[PDB]
Amino acid sequence: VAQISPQYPMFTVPLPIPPVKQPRLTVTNPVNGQEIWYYEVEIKPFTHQVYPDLGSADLVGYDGMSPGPTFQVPRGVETVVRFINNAEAPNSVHLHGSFSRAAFDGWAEDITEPGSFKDYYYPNRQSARTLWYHDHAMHITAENAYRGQAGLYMLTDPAEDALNLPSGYGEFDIPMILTSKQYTANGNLVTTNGELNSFWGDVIHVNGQPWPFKNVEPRKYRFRFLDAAVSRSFGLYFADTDAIDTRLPFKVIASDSGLLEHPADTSLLYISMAERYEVVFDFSDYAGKTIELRNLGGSIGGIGTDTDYDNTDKVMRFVVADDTTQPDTSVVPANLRDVPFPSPTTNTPRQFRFGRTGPTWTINGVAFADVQNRLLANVPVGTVERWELINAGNGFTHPIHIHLVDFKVISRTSGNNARTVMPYESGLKDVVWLGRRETVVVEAHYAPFPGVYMFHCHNLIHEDHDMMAAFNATVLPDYGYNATVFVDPMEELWQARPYELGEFQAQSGQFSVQAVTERIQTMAEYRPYAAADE
Ligand SMILES: *[C@@H]1O[C@H](CO)[C@@H](O[C@@H]2O[C@H](CO)[C@@H](O[C@@H]3O[C@H](CO)[C@@H](O)[C@H](O)[C@@H]3O)[C@H](O)[C@H]2NC(C)=O)[C@H](O)[C@H]1NC(C)=O
Ligand SMILES: *[C@@H]1O[C@H](CO)[C@@H](O[C@@H]2O[C@H](CO)[C@@H](O)[C@H](O)[C@H]2NC(C)=O)[C@H](O)[C@H]1NC(C)=O
Ligand SMILES: [Cu+2]
Ligand SMILES: [Cu+2]
Ligand SMILES: [Cu+2]
Ligand SMILES: [Cu+2]
Incomplete structure (x- = not known):
């Protein structure tokens, strides 16, 4: 048309x-003697002349550009990224493809207000892959992503x-x-x-x-x-x-x-x-x-x-x-x-129906904003589950994403007899497309970190209104690994903090080498990613 x-x-x-994003500092992890790469990203408005002979477009981007700068991180190097909100609306950064702890994963209510920043601690232990970091703030994820808050993150x-x-x-x-x-x-x-x-x-x-x-x-x-x-x-x-x-x-x-x-x-x-x-x-x-x-x-x-x-x-x-x-x-x-496929399971698949409830996009009739009802699965850490992901509608499609995990695509059925599993779906994924009338079974190891994580449609319009829910990767009270401070995405320890623009620009105050060094060494003492050691 x-x-x-x-x-x-x-x-x-x-x-x-x-351009490749460079870290500002390295900080010695007192737990393992290893260097943690520390980066600063300023979220800020900018204009870009897209059409040569017309006016400019209004954008908000990581380091004032879109796409955001590319991260390039070797497997085995932990990173801390200070995402600084100098914009007009709140943000929540998600590293898509990373088994980050709940409080470093971009939980949609885990926002940073303008004039605040948050330190994200990333493990970088998974297999070499193309990750991407992007906005995940409740209700406004589509517009934040659309206006420029996405960039690439290559794990090498x-x-x-x-x-x-x-x-x-x-x-x-x-x-x-x-x-x-x-x-x-x-x-x-x-x-x-x-x-x-x-x-x-x-x-x-x-x-x-x-x-x-x-x-x-x-x-x-x-x-x-x-x-x-x-x-x-x-x-x-x-x-x-x-x-x-x-x-x-x-x-x-x-x-x-x-x-x-x-x-x-x-x-x-x-x-x-x-x-x-x-x-x-x-x-x-x-x-x-x-x-x-x-x-x-x-x-x-x-x-x-x-x-x-x-x-x-x-x-x-x-x-x-x-x-x-x-x-x-x-x-x-x-x-x-050798793809590290999860163990096959004989457990009966959980069912998730992706449809509409009145005008709202829902999962099993539930909207993410509905706290009471939105926790749809409790999964003990280490369990393998099959999830049957159902698009019963012919009038819409849903790329379904599950945080924390990598999954195997087991099966696709189409009510239009259109296709089954594609050859390039033979490995491991974290998004799978439910085309018209498609049902997909995925198989995942809910491991290795306990916590409350999101799953949703990644059509950002559907996600925002409001096709998103949560699962709890659960542990028994004797589990250890400081689970008590890492399961709750809203844990006070890891929340955003206010800053003054002057200190940011002068690299003084809580942006001094001393302040950053003490903050990261304190974070590292909690040993967020120890359960993934080998
Ligand atoms: C998601 O799952 C985690 C567990 O993996 C849940 O955290 C656990 O919450 C239970 C119940 O609140 C805690 O046990 C209780 O501890 C209190 C205080 O010491 C005690 O008075 C109670 O009798 C009971 O023993 C447990 O410690 C806690 N575990 C951890 C590791 O934090 C969490 O509630 C779940 N989240 C949601 C939103 O369901
Ligand atoms: C859980 O986190 C706590 C707090 O960071 C860790 O305890 C600290 O351990 C360091 C070693 O880096 C000591 O020098 C500090 O004095 C400790 N602080 C407190 C209050 O204990 C603890 O090691 C972590 N435990 C696990 C299992 O990761
Ligand atoms: Cu994503
Ligand atoms: Cu994700
Ligand atoms: Cu959708
Ligand atoms: Cu998400």
């Missing part, structure tokens, strides 16, 4: 690469680096953060405020840029796909502009939680909100050609319900040189890793 946003000069602006491992996949952040390892937005006649964003069904967007962005292009060499690139859109799901394919409907083969090497067991040979990649898929595309057969990354129409070929617009079939263009300047020394091995 007709594009609403003004006409954009397609494929004329180079793909931006978010020299074992994955030894596979010799295409490498170098911004060289042959390229972030591909997909969003879908709408702009006014004067080039400002159309707000998501007021939208209660879905905010599709008619302008496709990669790394914050409408319909960009990139010059590539005829060799292999790693692409880290992330659907950071408010409501838009994609069906991605590559085509030569000389044969724009002919899909070119590629390999999926990783899902939300890390590498697949083997690359999945693929010409079409379904990716819904919050899903990450890493792809190796080989441009060697397309020297001197232009390859367009495109998006399936027909509401992702009958899987979705998303509205299609004039240019939502287009993502970006790659212009391929005639030759490489350096040898392609990268490979995609047939055997990537």
